[PDB]
Design a protein around this nucleic acid. Structure first.
Lengths: 421, 125, 421, 53, 125
RNA sequence: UUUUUUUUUUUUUUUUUUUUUUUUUUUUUUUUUUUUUUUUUUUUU
């Protein structure tokens, strides 16, 4: 904040903007408050009752989410596993060495208090329905997240995975059913259930019921896209996390990058509570989303696209960011990575390796740097008067041209329309 | 605003010489005609010399032809009047004038939108 | 005012124009008159009566806005929230510390007096309707403010949210119903209701009835477009509000900026009466609108568009402004932000930073400035005789070309028609 | 377009006026921070004549 | 971290000569006008010399014309003031001045955003 | 034979405008119309 004056008459003006808090909540800041996440559920009604409740309630449009939670607890409680090594997260020793833990060990069961009917009772439904009804209810979350005719694209795989369990399975919902289970996204206990399922099967993989985590895999790293673009950039470029970190040339991307890399959120732990910070109610606003880190998303994704990434061309273009500066910083990075192939011999036969020749004395000027050091490429870019060279812009054109089928509001169409012409 | 400052006047004897300097500021006079006028008290204000922006074309009054030498430097934003072989008739208050851009500078004072406060020039025996 | 005369005969003429007052009313100039805003409402009828009153009133074409306001008060009357901190605005302490306030603690309830409609009441209408019947009545404040028929997908998404509240919700309006609620925005008490709703739930974003903000969100900063383009320009460029205030190079844009930055209207406070200064009747003519600040809207919106803004394409081109001078200003500003990317290293590994070289003695003059200082770019622009260089017009062309689907009377079609030839 | 007027002279007058307003943007700094305003350079003496006002 | 560092001042007799150096650092002064000012004891700082970036066009104060030679070196980022044939009138505190890019430099001090701490120049009999 | 804008009653002269307004923006949240796991020539007795 600095004083601003209108030079016509030395009058003072104070330009101010409508602020917006939207603070960011981290997972570790939750477990210092409460050392356990509660799951509210009703254990009064028996299992075989709920299997018919949900079944005939699925056949119609009316079905209680409390019935599907109270049911899913019954259908999943008996399943347990055994740990190969200790398992602890945020100071919660859920297991130890060879402990046999259950899927609901990740949470603490509490009781939901409220009025609730039986809806519709149904018999004849065998226990084999308990083998696919959980998978169905869980998949309806993944189908309910998306909103367009590929809704059906994921639904039909929700079917394809059931004929594996029972060949004569058929979706017990109407075509209108696309309105039914979207609701289920707003029930906290449901999100906690699916998060517990994916957190469980992420440890006991290739367990016979690991097909259940289909549909619950969209819960792992939900609302955490920016760090996925960080890993994608570290994979496309081929550099380390630190070296990639050095190539951040924008203050906003720096602030967001420090925001993501808080040292106490277990973002590098294998099996942790962190990837499910949204559904496990650990955080109402994620630190690692492409909504609180838009500049890092646009930068780390455009740079990948210019490096011929396939994931990038469909990433969405965030709003209200520094488009120009971020594009220049991505062009310099992508051009440095594309020019500095850094080919080096890896194996030798007769113990003879490539020996470079240091006896070259020509005053090579404007030759781009030999590696991928930010320190040298910033000086070379300074020699170019901080304007991208025609070989840089030409390179970007060669990288974005011949791209076809670019969805609107994506960085693919942005790079194509910005560079190709 | 744009203003013209005249310096270098004074009282001298007949046959001496003076050097009037005029500093024009406030705008650009690249396409503006510079000039000098003078006024004797109780008499009319009259024209002595002018210099255009085109090739530094100089126009003199018959009363000073061969004696005065007007010049201008645009990089210095100045216009000088060199007054050699002065006469008592040349006693007056000299003003610097600068017409607006692309406009004529006439002997009557037509054009010549800007003026200076002036500098005194007295010539005695 | 300066004397004007005709040179042919020294006749004096006085050029004058038909004047238009249109004075502008600020929100602070209201609470110094009245220390509270009144809401006129009728409290005679009961809740269960008004429920069917406005249900059967909705199904038909006839309905009283006094019935929908007097019903909204009873439906939303017994709702509460405990403050985490003190709440006060314009010298009015509506809450304090751990107080538990309600939605209508913001306005002082008065009484409406006169004849009341009979209202064709209906019974058998249970209480679950009040779970969504307000959300309906509120949402139609939004739908009724858009005149494009294709845009009234808002009614469909209202049907989606109410259909989320009750699975079997169906629009209690005829296809002629779009005529019904349009006049609802003309009842000052109705606007004072929706503004109180959004102003309430803007402080309580965690409340379970926050979905009610749907429809009322268009009440916040209603008739406040230019103030939003100021933040948009402060976001697209990346320069602080003061630095962007320095790039204002037109007289009208400066006068409008001073008009917008009057220092007593709480435009930086989070939860204030200011964003709702139109519905709350705090102002009849807003100071922050693109109608009283046209040159600033055109200027900032065009400058944003030239910097690859996706929002600026569809902004409207106001009438009776200096398009030429404003376009040269936005051209210089935009080319200055685009040229000067201002790349700088942010993180280092071996504590080796880019050290610039000052030994470049070749004197590369006649080159654009290195940063985004108004003082330097104005002088550089004076070296070009205040005429845009070909690299500037080509920069604008490359930004406005490949702009498809441009609506008429927009600044996108204006820049496309101005720079792409 | 009204009838029976001097279309030619009127078009030339409007052409010179519109070209004058279009050329002379008259951009001038309005707000400053550290009390640093644009100070034009008067040491330009290469005689850049034959340029519009 | 832009700054101007002046060296070379001192006490000399009348008729002596000094050389003032100004190390400009922190940014780039390619399109900048550089200059010198001097602050007399009990008087406001006054103009002595300015050297532009356009063909090294120099402007001097009337008090120093013929005595001071101002120059600059862009490869060394230095600005020099050569003080020959000094006078006690020249006794003051000399400051180095720099201007923002394409921004003008005026004798009154207008422009010239950057200044130094200055050096002492004392000239006695 | 007349004649000679397939001009014109008169006003008039954005197929402008009640007012307000101005992304046919936004509940929140998020945004590869990515992913169960394997896996990768719509290769092969």
């Amino acid at each position: 904040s600095v004083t601003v004056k209108r030079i016509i008459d030395n009058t003072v003006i104070v330009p101010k903007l409508p602020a917006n808090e939207d603070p960011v909540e981290y997972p570790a800041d939750y477990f210092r408050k409460s050392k356990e996440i509660p799951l509210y559920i009703n254990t009064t009604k028996s299992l075989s009752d709920l299997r018919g409740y949900v079944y005939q309630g699925l056949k119609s449009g009316n079905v209680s989410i409390i019935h599907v939670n109270s049911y899913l607890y019954g259908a999943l409680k008996d399943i347990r596993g055994k740990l190969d090594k200790d398992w602890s997260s945020f100071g919660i020793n859920i297991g130890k060495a060879g402990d046999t833990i259950g899927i609901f060990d990740l949470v603490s069961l509490k009781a939901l208090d409220g009025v609730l009917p039986d809806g519709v009772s149904d018999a004849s439904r065998t226990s084999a329905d308990d083998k696919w009804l959980p998978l169905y209810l869980l998949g309806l979350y993944r189908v309910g997240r998306t909103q367009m005719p590929e809704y059906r694209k994921k639904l039909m795989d929700g079917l394809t995975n059931q004929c594996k369990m029972i060949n004569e399975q058929f979706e017990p919902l109407v075509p209108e059913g696309r309105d039914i289970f979207d609701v289920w996204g707003n029930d906290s206990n449901y999100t906690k259930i699916v998060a517990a399922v994916d957190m469980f099967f992420h440890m006991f993989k290739k367990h016979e019921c690991a097909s259940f985590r289909y549909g619950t895999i969209v819960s792992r790293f939900k609302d955490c896209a920016a760090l996925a673009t960080f890993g994608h950039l570290c994979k496309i470029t081929g550099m380390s996390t630190e070296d990639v970190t050095t190539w951040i040339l924008n203050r906003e991307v720096a602030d967001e990058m420090v925001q993501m890399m808080l040292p106490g959120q277990e973002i590098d732990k294998a099996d942790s509570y962190m990837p499910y910070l949204i559904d496990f109610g650990l955080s109402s606003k994620s630190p690692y989303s492409s909504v609180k880190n838009p500049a890092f998303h646009f930068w780390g994704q455009l740079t990948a696209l210019l490096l011929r990434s396939t994931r990038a061309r469909n990433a969405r273009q965030p709003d209200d960011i520094e488009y120009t500066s971020l594009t220049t910083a991505g062009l310099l990075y992508a051009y440095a990575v594309g020019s500095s192939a850094d080919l080096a011999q890896q194996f030798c036969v007769g113990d003879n390796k490539y020996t470079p020749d240091d006896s070259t004395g020509g005053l090579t000027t404007n030759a781009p740097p030999q590696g991928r050091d930010v320190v040298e490429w910033l000086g070379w870019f300074e020699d170019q008067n901080r304007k991208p060279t025609p070989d840089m812009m030409q390179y970007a054109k060669r990288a974005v041209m011949s791209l076809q089928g670019l969805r609107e509001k994506t960085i693919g169409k942005y790079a194509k329309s910005e560079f190709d012409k | 605003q744009v203003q013209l400052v005249e310096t270098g006047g004074g009282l001298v004897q007949t046959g001496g010489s003076l050097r009037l300097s005029c500093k024009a500021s406030g705008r650009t006079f690249s396409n503006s005609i510079m000039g000098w006028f003078r006024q004797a008290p109780g008499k009319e204000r009259d024209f002595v010399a002018k210099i255009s922006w085109r090739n530094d074309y100089t126009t003199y009054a018959d009363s000073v032809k061969g004696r005065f030498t007007i010049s201008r430097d645009n990089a210095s934003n100045m216009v000088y009047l060199l007054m050699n072989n002065l006469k008592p008739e040349d006693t007056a208050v000299y003003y610097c004038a600068a017409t607006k851009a692309y406009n004529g500078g006439e002997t009557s004072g037509r054009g010549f939108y800007y003026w200076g406060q002036g500098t005194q020039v007295t010539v005695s025996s």
